[PDB]
Amino acid sequence: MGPSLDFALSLLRRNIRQVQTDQGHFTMLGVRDRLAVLPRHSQPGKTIWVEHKLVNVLDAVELVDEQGVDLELTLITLDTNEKFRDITKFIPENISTASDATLVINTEHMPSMFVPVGDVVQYGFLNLSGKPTHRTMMYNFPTKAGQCGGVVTSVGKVVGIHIGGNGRQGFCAGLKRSYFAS
Ligand SMILES: CCOC(=O)CC[C@H](C[C@@H]1CCNC1=O)NC(=O)[C@@H](CC(=O)[C@@H](NC(=O)c1cc(C)on1)C(C)C)Cc1ccc(F)cc1
């Protein structure tokens, strides 16, 4: 509710970017330095649109956890002029569920949008259009196409990235701090 909403708003300007790839429109969380995270499904190429600018991509590396499981997110590094404000400290050391979370969407079509998704609960194994992953979490909210990459936040942590849904529920890849270690 209110507390996750205001924390979510504090991330928006400095860290939550509108992007476009050949696959469509996505929300992108910038984490530190020139490092950001996107859904694998966005399939970033050699350039990517960020806000109004076509930006060269330094690399895109699929995020695979310490158990060898693809998390369906890719870590992208960018030929941006400025570094992102470092939000490492807001990514929890442990994958975290949360009550009354906020999902932040920021795309050209859904700009600066805060979605009260309610409680985010453990889900675990998830088969997303035939691609299996784990460590996912679920919220009973009817998320939509165009919300992938959306940032799931608690009172003061960034806990997940929206990756899929079935029309009545939504699912995020869980985040923990070690995923972003250099
Ligand atoms: C570029 C445009 O594409 C997009 O908009 C990305 C947006 C949507 C957001 C969905 C869109 C709808 N409700 C939502 O919240 N995401 C996907 O579509 C994903 C597929 C699903 O959500 C599928 N769901 C399940 O499999 C699923 C399983 C359970 C359990 O619940 N849902 C549905 C398409 C059927 C794409 C994907 C494929 C393979 C993966 F490794 C990982 C992801």
Both 108 and 158 in one domain: the answer is: yes
Residues 22 and 68 in one domain: yes
Residue 66 designated active-site: no
Nearest to 27 by CA among 162, 139, 135, 173: 162
If asked whether residues 23 and 72 sit together in one domain, one would say: yes
Based on the domain organization, do 9 and 55 belong to the same domain? no
Report the distance separating Cα 41 and Cα 171, nearest Å.
Answer: 14
The answer on 125 and 177 residing in a single domain is yes
Query: Do both 31 and 75 map to the same domain?
Result: yes
62 Cβ partners below 8 Å, 6+ apart?
40, 70, 73, 74, 75
Total domain count, the chain: 2
Question: Residue 64 forms beta bridges with which residues?
Answer: 70
Which method, experimentally, gave rise to this model?
X-ray
5 and 61 assigned to the same domain:
no
Domain span at 24: 16-84
CB-side neighbour CA atoms (13 Å) of 35: 16
**Token pair listed for 172:** 């995020």
Side chain identity, residue 90: F
Which atom of ligand 1 lies at the shortest distance from residue 23's CA? Answer: 1
Q: How far is the CA of 164 from the centre of ligand 1 (A)?
A: 4
C-beta neighbour count of 60 within 10 angstroms? 19
End residue of a domain, out of 24, 49, 84: 84
d(CA 169, CA 179) in angstroms, rounded, equals 25
**Is there a catalytic annotation at residue 134?**
no
Neighbour count for residue 73 (Cβ, 10 Å): 25
User: Is there a catalytic annotation at residue 108?
Assistant: no
C-alpha 147 to ligand 1 mean position (Å): 10
